[PDB]
Symmetry: D2
Subunit: 261 residues, 4 copies
């Protein structure tokens, strides 16, 4: 069991297609004891999380709510049992209003929308670490989800900016986590056909070119309908097998980003 | 001169130590016709800009004020004259509340403070391009100020995250600017004493003087010129070559 | 164990301080079945490899010898048994004459010396893959050792150039390995006190001390140069099935030093 | 009042009038630079090509694989520019890779002897030229080399990619040496030029300001900008004159 006896917090489950769902499933398969955090539709998330191989407490967490962050540690402790701490934290949270991601021109995203997206997608990574590092064990691991933002691309627009910011946040979180003997890293994954992944002919064709370029580039290929390789990479970072890796990005994209054509 | 007859907008002058002040001075020395944008203390900024070698109209621009952005192009046109356009735009705007940049712990910066900083330091680069690209000429150049955020460091804290965001914004602005025949780039400058640093002069193969902004100002002018015509969505490093050296 | 039943080739053992020795030890502890390759002093290497927790066949491999590479696959097959293939290959080979790595000025390294170093440290990664990919299994993993060469530094000189070339070789090897369902990655490690101060004199002794001490200061989780286990563990992670979508890439086992400025 | 007025510059790498070096030399001359040219192997043919440049320039023989040429190069340049005068700029536009390590030939089928000759000419020689010409270079000087972005693998480019990865590393070490003379060292990572169809086509779409492979002037202009006094704080670095394609995914 890769994660045998490890207590791990998993945020970001909304559907069974969610990257977090797959992380949670693989982590449980690998012996982990999870705590799950959900946003807004908690009774709907519970029906989904009931599909996971093992039972796990579900706690409410809106990263934009300062009360949820202030009480999160006390609530996790109550769930895992007093005297027990977390060995891992998984941030699989992202959000960008349609104005900043999709068909809307780059220049037409109002800052209020961009700011909500950066708050949820990038700032919250620090918010979660701030809240959960006091209840984390030495040898611990914080993992976040990334989509390589080193180059501009169509449609992604302001979410590309939020990922650029998240990569910077990660590096600063590693400085803090280090003080606790905790590692902080991001998994930069290739495109995964979640429920969200209708937009019209132009954008439908844009996502087809990205998805098709990914598999051509990827020397080992890229299956967008399979989230298991991503989930297994997060679990590798949660394990004890990458003990000298922190403030870094691990690419689970089939190698696509290392190839030009 | 390097920018003879070029009409260039320069934002970010507050003191004579400001990076923008040096860009403006070197650009004027190189034949550029300037339009200057100031923020908040406009009568004070006019006292300071009067110190440059040539006269230049001063316009108010608060990047957080949507009215200023909506009228900016019409106000620049009025200043340079109807029928004339900008050949260059310089973004030398940055801000981060003390909670997000300095001795305050990284985790203690409230998001409202971080958001104001990202708005001013990163989002505004797109706001200025959106406002000024319709009144820009083919062959034009938009330049922004950067401080290499690729690796974390002490104190820079949330301003590093704003810089990381600005680098991403610049790559997207280049896609838009490109439709107008305009280049968009950032100058990742070394530390400058304008109103962390010592290792820079050692690391830099050609050295680094923090008390001198002229090498940074010159690089911005090179990017504003016609001598880097195939460079866009990129970062030019004017830091004495420190970022390429480990020790 | 992490590598239970996996047949893995490990090159680069010369002493028990060797990074490869630690990879081999951790891999055996994790259930791997090993084949070991040695250079020049085979009787010497056999004495060291006898210290590993399990017995493993030792084969001769000089990466500059074309006969050694041409017969390597047939020799590995003979050792693991016909009908069996490798699930992993570990390249822990590096060399740079004193002329190009150390106190000697950068400009004073003759090309013949630079070329031998690039041959051993960078070209050989492709040579090993060319030789061992026909006898590798889908799901396989080739791992190479790296030292972050993205920025220049004192004394590393031409070995930085060899690492810069090796990083490029790896990306091309991933294109080839990919056709076999094999991944190809590098572990960019922080400095480790292997067998290979005072020897270089005052000036350079102090230079390598600042470089080495900068790693623990920069690394948010610290850096112990007297410990190869974290590096060995990362190689094993790359050899496992837990990074299945990572290829042509570099994994940094440096305490996170390369992500920090100061 | 040209960009490079009165600057004495060495330009290596002219073989045809399609050569990137030919365009650097032409735009440098147009900008006031006094040039010294170095040629390889077919020197009488290289003289026929340089006679097409705007101004007269001495032509010297330089085979980067020849140790005698490198050892005498400085003395020969000094003789050409005049005793008491030094170089303000050096341009390395030299590259070579046998067909075994670049093209349709499988990556694994390139023998090391071929790879080594290519790395010698394309990467090591950048340090060889600096070693030879830095003693005869002025403070404020500039050494520029030609690059093709090797940060990601691609088809055909094969071992040449590895040579450019090595050259980028050599450039960073040359900056440490050049720095002692008050000299900068940089590379121009240029987009593709006709001096492969997917490279050449994919480039103009991705590049926000477009990319014309039939035009070397934008590349020549960037080299001249690096040779000028307008990038005085840039060393050990790479300037991308590629239309901006490398900053773009699609
Ligand atoms: N789907 C892909 O192709 C892909 C690729 C790379 C990276 N990612 C990243 O993976 C992560 C998860 O994406 P996914 O594709 O699994 O999508 P998803 O829609 O299943 O999950 C995003 C999650 O964020 C949560 N969330 C939104 N606002 C929140 C708030 N205020 N507080 C707390 N939680 C909030 C949502 O409820 C949801 O659970 C994101 O960071 C995303 O950017 C996705
Ligand atoms: N100072 C350095 O060492 C250094 C190094 C690299 C990059 N930079 C960057 O260079 C730029 C200029 O900084 P500086 O060092 O000249 O300092 P500064 O104090 O002179 O400049 C910052 C400018 O931003 C302006 N500004 C702030 N909020 C604004 C708003 N809402 N609307 C309009 N203008 C606003 C200020 O008035 C000022 O003119 C910044 O973007 C900074 O991040 C600075
Ligand atoms: N020691 C460090 O601090 C450090 C840091 C990062 C990377 N590395 C890398 O780790 C790898 C192994 O080095 P190490 O530190 O364990 O030292 P080492 O001396 O044990 O390893 C180098 C190995 O290369 C072998 N070798 C040399 N020439 C050969 C040839 N022609 N054919 C076959 N094998 C040959 C040697 O016999 C030796 O086993 C190298 O690639 C090195 O660059 C070392
Ligand atoms: N053409 C492109 O698409 C392109 C793009 C980016 C970079 N480059 C680089 O630009 C440089 C010049 O290439 P080019 O496209 O102008 O073609 P080219 O063939 O005209 O230039 C290469 C030059 O190197 C010289 N040379 C070769 N071996 C030599 C030796 N042993 N000693 C001395 N000189 C020697 C040749 O004589 C020739 O003049 C190369 O470094 C190349 O990699 C080319
Ligand atoms: C390829 C890709 C990357 C992402 O980050 C997201 C994403 C963005 C916001 C919220 C959730 C996922 C999507 C849908 N696709
Ligand atoms: C080294 C350095 C980098 C910067 O970005 C700024 C800066 C930050 C906000 C506003 C103005 C300048 C400073 C003062 N120094
Ligand atoms: C820090 C470091 C990096 C290296 O690559 C080697 C090395 C160089 C050549 C051969 C073997 C190891 C050493 C000793 N140290
Ligand atoms: C795109 C591109 C890159 C290069 O390096 C060369 C090249 C290779 C060897 C010698 C000269 C140029 C060419 C022709 N094209």
């Amino acid at each position: 069991g890769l994660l045998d006896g490890k207590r791990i917090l998993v945020s970001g489950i909304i559907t069974d297609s969610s990257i977090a769902f797959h992380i949670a499933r693989v982590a449980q398969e690998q012996g982990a004891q999870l705590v799950l955090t959900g946003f807004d539709r908690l009774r709907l998330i519970q029906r989904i999380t009931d599909r996971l191989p093992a039972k796990a407490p579900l706690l409410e967490l809106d990263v934009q709510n300062e009360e949820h962050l202030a009480s999160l540690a006390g609530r996790v402790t109550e769930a895992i049992g007093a005297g027990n701490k977390l060995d891992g934290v998984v941030h699989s949270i992202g959000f960008m209003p349609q104005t900043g991601m999709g068909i809307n021109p780059f220049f037409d995203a109002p800052y209020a929308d961009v700011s909500k997206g950066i708050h949820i997608s990038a700032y919250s990574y620090a918010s979660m670490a701030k809240a959960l590092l006091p209840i984390m064990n030495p040898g611990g691991s914080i993992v976040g989800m990334d989509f390589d933002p080193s180059r501009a691309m169509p449609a992604y627009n302001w979410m590309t900016v939020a990922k650029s910011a998240l990569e910077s946040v990660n590096r600063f979180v590693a400085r803090e986590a280090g003080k606790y003997g905790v590692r902080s890293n991001l998994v930069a994954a290739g495109p995964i056909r979640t429920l969200a992944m209708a937009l019209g002919e132009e954008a439908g064709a844009q996502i087809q070119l990205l998805e098709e370029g990914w598999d051509q580039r990827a020397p080992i290929g890229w299956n967008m309908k399979d989230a298991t390789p991503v989930a297994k990479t997060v679990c590798a970072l949660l394990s004890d097998w990458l003990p000298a890796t922190t403030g870094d990005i691990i690419y689970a994209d089939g190698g696509a980003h290392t190839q030009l054509l």
